[PDB]
């Protein structure tokens, strides 16, 4: 539906084509699933860090006073 420009170095692309051939996918499928599952990891870790800071601010408001 959308578009993106990605520039590589002939070492990125040969390696990505090799790892696509390994996992039985296209280079498009491989790069898309790579970026996608990595985005899943990244959003999850950001969310966990946000929960850590939420609990932190809770306990810092408790130790100040009611």
């Amino acid at each position: 539906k959308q578009r993106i420009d990605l520039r590589l170095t002939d070492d990125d692309k040969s390696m990505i084509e090799e790892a696509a051939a390994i996992s039985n996918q296209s280079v498009s499928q491989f790069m898309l699933n790579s970026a996608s599952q990595r985005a899943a990891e990244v959003i999850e870790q950001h969310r966990r860090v946000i929960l850590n800071e939420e609990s932190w601010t809770r306990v810092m408001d408790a130790l100040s006073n009611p």
Binding site: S55, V59, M60, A62, L63, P66
Partner: protein
């Protein structure tokens, strides 16, 4: 001075921070160059023992911060706690530990808190904390101690 009290640092930065001296250049320097900023960057909550003077002559302090124990499980740590040389030997460090324990306890009613770790620099502070109830830890943690929240609660009954 029958008129000294303990308070949260009121973010005035309006305390006589320099005539303080407690015996250790490390804690003196921490109070004078960090404590205000680390209280203002929410890494610690700092409580001051001073008197109701024009400028609230600093005579003691302690810091509290949230921690976890592992190997997340929540707790608090009393990192630093110092008191001027003139007030020493007169159970004022015990009073400030009791006040920090009371703060931790009134926190444990709003947030889950399993206990209070405490930082002890020399064997002086280790004996001192060990004398108030704290459990001496071992190994890499030999310079830390712990007091359960349940004991802090039994205190105030």
């Amino acid at each position: 001075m029958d008129d000294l009290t303990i308070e949260i640092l009121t973010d005035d930065a309006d305390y006589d921070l320099q005539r303080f001296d407690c015996g250790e250049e490390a804690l003196n320097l921490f109070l004078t160059t960090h404590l205000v900023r680390q209280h203002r960057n929410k890494i610690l909550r700092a409580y001051i023992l001073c008197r109701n003077t024009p400028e609230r002559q600093v005579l003691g302090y302690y810091t509290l911060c949230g921690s976890c124990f592992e190997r997340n499980i929540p707790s608090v740590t009393l990192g630093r706690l110092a008191i001027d040389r003139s007030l020493q030997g007169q159970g004022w460090g015990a009073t400030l530990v009791a006040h920090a324990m009371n703060v931790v306890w009134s926190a444990s009613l709003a947030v889950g808190i399993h206990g209070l770790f405490v930082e002890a620099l020399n064997e002086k502070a280790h004996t001192f904390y060990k004398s108030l109830g704290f459990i001496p830890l071992v190994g890499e943690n030999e310079n830390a101690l712990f007091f359960p929240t349940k004991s802090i609660e039994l205190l105030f009954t």
